[PDB]
RNA sequence: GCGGUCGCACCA
RNA sequence: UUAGGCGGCCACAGCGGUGGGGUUGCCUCCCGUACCCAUCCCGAACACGGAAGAUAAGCCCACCAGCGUUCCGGGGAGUACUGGAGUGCGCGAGCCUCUGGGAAACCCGGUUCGCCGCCACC
RNA sequence: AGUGCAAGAGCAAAAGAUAGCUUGACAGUGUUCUUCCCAACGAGGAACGCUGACGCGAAAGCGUGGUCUAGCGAACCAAUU
RNA sequence: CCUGUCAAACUCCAAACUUACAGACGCCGUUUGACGCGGGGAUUCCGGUGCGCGGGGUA
């Protein structure tokens, strides 16, 4: 930018999208990566490999299509992170992928956090993942229980319209349920 | 001393101060003479040529120039033309004044390294080459056989 | 030279030009190579570790098995055969 | 357009610069949370020569904390002009700084794909007197 | 295709430059070889240039050359139309000569020593100080240049 | 190593 | 790719600036703190929960060359330098010829305001 | 800028700063390069492994002292494990 | 802004050239066995000059 000696950072730095020093570390296993991403509404789970041009993604699912199997929840919260793990989990194993690191691109390892119910979803689909159990959240956090309670302090629904008044972490249970077994895209 | 021990330019360019200590101060007084506050806004110009790359210890800049422009007053202490030495002795010079044993040299001066046809001084003047004559002179005390070119002057 | 240490005269070599300054893409690390493959030897200046000694710096060898992560590369200085242990990061496949 | 281009306050830094403390009581009551410690860099004459080291402490006010805090503040200052920034900043006073910004400022305080705030976003010196002195009192 | 001819000795010249001589079949001085004009070939004469003298030949002078100074890759007999006929793909000299001009074989492929052991120039080089184009005999030439050497070397 | 800068001792 | 995620090359992509775009696939800003989690002080950030509002930031889309960068034409320049050769010149420093290579600055005019891969998606 | 110390080199979501924790400055044994270009030569040095035991981290992973190139010493004898 | 100069321990640039590996031609080797391996025997470790490139030195 200010001369021929100056140094532009790689795009990607730029972007603050990828931090690099953690990508080496990642790539390092020479495993597949489960690439972890959230957004204010929705959570996405990736299982990519490296490739020749870039990275090459060989199985994936989305908060949101997740609907497409029932869902009919918001899609910015923990169970649906879950699901969103599992859904993948299995998508990849039918590729023929048995294992992966987690990779939370610019998240921080907060315990019980959403990437790592993504983690756990993954894990549960039949994935082998390097992870650690007591930094995962405790099951009915997973369901969707803490949201369930904060409705019963209501007064007001915590949804608005959407589905129930005081919510379902029953409805968790009815789709991790229909996800293990049968079903298309699977 | 002689020019003889340090006019040719076959040792390696030597003018880092920052590893050489001792370097005598430059004799040459100015660079820029006449009326220095004008710029080059002269119908003349004619320039002092070195025809060989040679080296050119500041005393020979000094007396040179001196002798040029102390002639140069036959145009009177503020006169109108400017007068320009455009080389620096930037050249750091030696001297082995034990025998040949750790003969490396104590700084005794410098000089400026000047490649043939390069002009070594430049003067302005009207119609009133007075400098041809300053420089037949300058190039009197300098080791070259030089070249007294005329550049903007058509008027023959 | 005034000191026979391995990084003598390698001022050049071992150096950056500016916009190649930074640490290095990943892509390069990583690099997976099979034994009888070609290799150019070249360290990275930004890059600390898996590196060989700089005389070797230019040389094109033979991927023959590894070591750890590191490659094991065949090389021959002069007339004499050698191996260097190095890893991905310095080396590049011939063509 | 407007509504996401109306100034606000974000944070308002309480801070006694000492030079050595028992202070810290008076900013917590004067703002109404713990007040936070203030090392200091460099060696130097005023008996400053210790790097880690307590010489002072501050206090950042957001939200309710902030205004509750300024509907005291400001009233006890009269200042104005001059002694804004050029991003429509002031600080009066102790000392009580008061930083002012648009709606889309976390874009720069995020970890991902965070960005700079562009220069016509950025909230001017007299941008920034409007919505003040709009707010309880009079600019100059 | 081009005639080289040696023009000075060993002595003192370097080996990097004996060595491409050498590759060309020349080992002695008024030594010819018949070079294809080729990149790989183009560069050795190149290397070679200040100690030869080169161009390409008129289908006639080579034809006086090889009937002249052309070898059996063994022994004494001397190569006339017969020998080439009975002996080569083609059936007399002139057929052998235009067939080395336009590359289409060598030396060596019919049977043929690869060099061309010329006698000393009758009256005389021009000289092994100087190029031909300061009047000396060294490097390129043209093919009435070549054809005067290859003709006072017959 | 031992003794008060010094003195003693000591085949790596 | 009517806005996404992971990347490869790592300024041709930087710096600066103009215009356009969202009842929704969307991304954001945004709203909010019972929870998991969090600030040596602040739900600012991090984390979690969510949609009343917005397209003003960001982002995506279209474009501008003033700066920086890449490549190209013409000029500089077959100049500077240089591998090989010489009973060529020069008191000498050094130069010249033949042969094989061949620049930098700078000026003028174009180019460049990223390209490409995998996945997902009215 | 900083990174203990020459000089040159490396480094920015870090190789720097702050905080916290920890003792891998670990035992054993090697491969290779260096010392000594080519091209034989010891001590020493480094790179990269493995076996064992550990530290930290969600984890990939990092830690074979200090970002790299100086800071080193045979046989005999003694003391020590 | 304009204007005057430099660098063995400067570099936004940048040759000629030297060099690793590979293919092609050439040359060479398969009875003259190359490339290479193992063994016996040395001499040698005062060098000099021209040319190109040098560093020191008035030379
Ligand atoms: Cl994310
Ligand atoms: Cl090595
Ligand atoms: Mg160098
Ligand atoms: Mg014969
Ligand atoms: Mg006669
Ligand atoms: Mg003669
Ligand atoms: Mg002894
Ligand atoms: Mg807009
Ligand atoms: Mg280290
Ligand atoms: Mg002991
Ligand atoms: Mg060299
Ligand atoms: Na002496
Ligand atoms: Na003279
Ligand atoms: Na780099
Ligand atoms: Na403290
Ligand atoms: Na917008
Ligand atoms: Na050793």
């Not at chain 2, 040719?8 to 200590?21: G, L």
């Not at chain 2, 145009?75 to 033309?81: I, K, Q, T």
Request: aromatic share 6%.
């Amino acid at each position: 930018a200010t001369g021929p000696r100056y140094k532009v950072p790689m795009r990607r730095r730029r972007e603050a999208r990828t931090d690099y020093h953690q990508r080496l570390r990642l790539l390092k296993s020479g495993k597949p990566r489960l690439v972890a991403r959230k957004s204010n509404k929705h959570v996405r789970a990736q299982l990519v490999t490296l490739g020749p041009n870039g990275d090459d993604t060989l199985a994936s699912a989305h908060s949101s299509d997740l609907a497409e199997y029932g869902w009919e929840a918001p899609t910015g919260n923990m169970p649906s992170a879950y699901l969103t793990g599992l859904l993948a989990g299995l998508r990849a194993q039918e590729a023929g992928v048995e294992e992966a690191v987690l990779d939370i691109g610019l998240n921080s390892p907060t315990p019980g956090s959403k990437v790592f119910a993504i983690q756990e979803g993954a894990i549960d689909a039949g994935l082998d993942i390097p992870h650690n159990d007591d930094v995962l959240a405790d099951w009915q956090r997973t369901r969707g229980a803490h949201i369930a309670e904060y409705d019963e302090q209501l007064e007001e629904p915590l949804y608005s319209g959407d589905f129930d008044a005081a919510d379902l972490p029953e409805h968790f249970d009815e789709l991790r349920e229909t996800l293990l077994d049968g079903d298309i895209e699977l | 001393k002689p020019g003889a021990m340090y006019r040719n330019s076959s040792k390696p360019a030597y003018t880092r101060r920052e590893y050489i200590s001792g370097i005598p101060g430059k004799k040459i007084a100015q660079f820029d003479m006449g009326n220095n506050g004008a710029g080059p806004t002269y119908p003349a110009q004619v320039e002092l040529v070195v025809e060989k790359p040679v080296q050119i210890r500041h005393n020979a800049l000094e007396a040179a120039r001196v002798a040029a422009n102390r002639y140069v007053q036959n145009s009177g202490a503020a006169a109108n033309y400017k007068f320009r030495i455009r080389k620096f002795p930037f050249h750091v010079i030696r001297e082995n004044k034990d025998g040949m044993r750790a003969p490396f040299g104590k700084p005794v001066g410098t000089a400026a390294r000047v490649h043939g046809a390069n002009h070594i001084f430049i003067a302005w003047v009207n119609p009133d080459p007075n400098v041809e004559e300053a420089w037949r002179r300058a190039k009197m005390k300098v080791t070259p056989t030089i070249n007294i070119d005329s550049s903007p002057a058509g008027n023959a | 030279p005034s000191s026979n240490g391995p990084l003598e005269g390698t001022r050049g070599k071992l150096k950056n030009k500016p916009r190649d300054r930074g640490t290095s893409p990943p892509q390069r690390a990583v690099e997976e190579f099979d034994d009888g493959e070609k290799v150019h030897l070249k360290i990275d200046p930004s890059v600390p570790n898996g590196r060989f000694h700089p005389r070797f710096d230019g040389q094109t060898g033979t991927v023959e098995g590894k070591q750890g992560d590191a490659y094991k590369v065949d090389i021959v200085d002069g007339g004499k055969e050698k191996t260097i242990i190095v890893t991905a990061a310095h080396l590049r496949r011939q063509e | 357009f407007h509504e996401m281009r109306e100034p606000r306050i974000e944070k308002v830094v309480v801070h006694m610069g000492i030079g050595h403390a028992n202070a810290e009581d008076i900013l917590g009551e004067i703002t109404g949370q713990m007040p936070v410690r203030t090392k200091a860099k460099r060696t130097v004459g005023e008996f400053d020569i210790r790097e880690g080291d307590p010489i002072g402490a501050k206090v950042t006010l957001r939200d309710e904390m902030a205004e509750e805090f300024l509907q005291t503040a400001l009233p006890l200052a009269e200042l104005a002009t001059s002694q804004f920034d050029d991003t429509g900043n002031f600080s009066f006073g102790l000392d009580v700084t008061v930083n002012l910004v648009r709606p889309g400022y976390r874009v720069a305080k995020r970890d991902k794909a965070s960005r700079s705030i562009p220069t016509k976003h950025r909230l001017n010196p007299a941008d920034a007197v409007a919505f003040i002195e709009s707010t309880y009192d009079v600019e100059v | 295709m081009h005639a080289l001819v040696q023009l000075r000795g060993e002595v003192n010249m370097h080996t990097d430059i004996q060595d491409t001589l050498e590759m060309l079949n020349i080992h002695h001085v008024n030594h010819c070889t018949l070079v294809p004009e080729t990149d790989a070939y183009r560069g050795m004469v190149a290397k070679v240039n200040d100690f030869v003298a080169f161009g390409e030949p008129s289908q006639e002078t080579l034809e006086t050359v090889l009937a002249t100074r052309a070898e059996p890759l063994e022994g004494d007999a001397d190569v006339d139309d017969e020998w080439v006929a009975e002996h080569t793909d083609y059936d007399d000299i002139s057929g052998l000569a235009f067939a080395l001009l336009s590359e289409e074989t060598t030396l060596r492929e019919q049977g043929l020593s690869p060099t061309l052991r010329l006698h000393p120039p009758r009256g005389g080089h021009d000289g092994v100080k100087h190029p031909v184009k300061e009047g000396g005999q060294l490097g390129k030439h043209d093919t009435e240049g070549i054809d005067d050497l290859l003709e006072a070397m017959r």
